[PDB]
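Researcher: Sequence of Dynein heavy chain, outer arm protein follows. Predict its structure.
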Amino acid sequence: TWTSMNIESYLYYVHQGLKKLEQLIINVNDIIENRIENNLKTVSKVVLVHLPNVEVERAVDDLLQTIMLYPLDPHVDPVLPEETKRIKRYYFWYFYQALLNSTQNSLNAMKYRVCGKKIPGANTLQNLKPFFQVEVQLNGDKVTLNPSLQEIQKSINRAATAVLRCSKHLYNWDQQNKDSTDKATFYDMIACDKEIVKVILLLTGSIQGTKN
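Model: Prediction complete. Tokens:
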């Protein structure tokens, strides 16, 4: 600071590094904070039972896209940030949890609101299910739904199982290609989680109450 030089240039060079980094973060903001967020909102909003591939492609593409951001999927060799690298992975795992949880919250909302079938609308694969009509007569002189009501619940469970296997075999951010990048164990975990196994009891209980 005595000849009044080189300090403005050092300050300007650090400013240059900081503006380049502020840039790179503005990248990451743009590139992560909204496309995969809106994809997550869509994944949450997808009604699995009935609604009158896409987001899977989308998530694979978001992976390759984030990979374009120079992210250290392997640790930097000269820096050796082995601990460092796994924290973005824990965050991306929390986000993958938010994705599977979007699907899971949908699944659970539907498992709860099965009872009003006429109110929601169905998609093509699920044409037989909505507001199910059953024939009633004197089966062996006894008034019954001619299709066994138990059978109709097994048809509801067959729709549920088609949906559940479609949702268990996915290609999400971790499952990139046939679960190659990461396993699909969270989906069988969800299948044995309360929203499925414990709500089967509530389903069958309301069903037996209808029978009652």
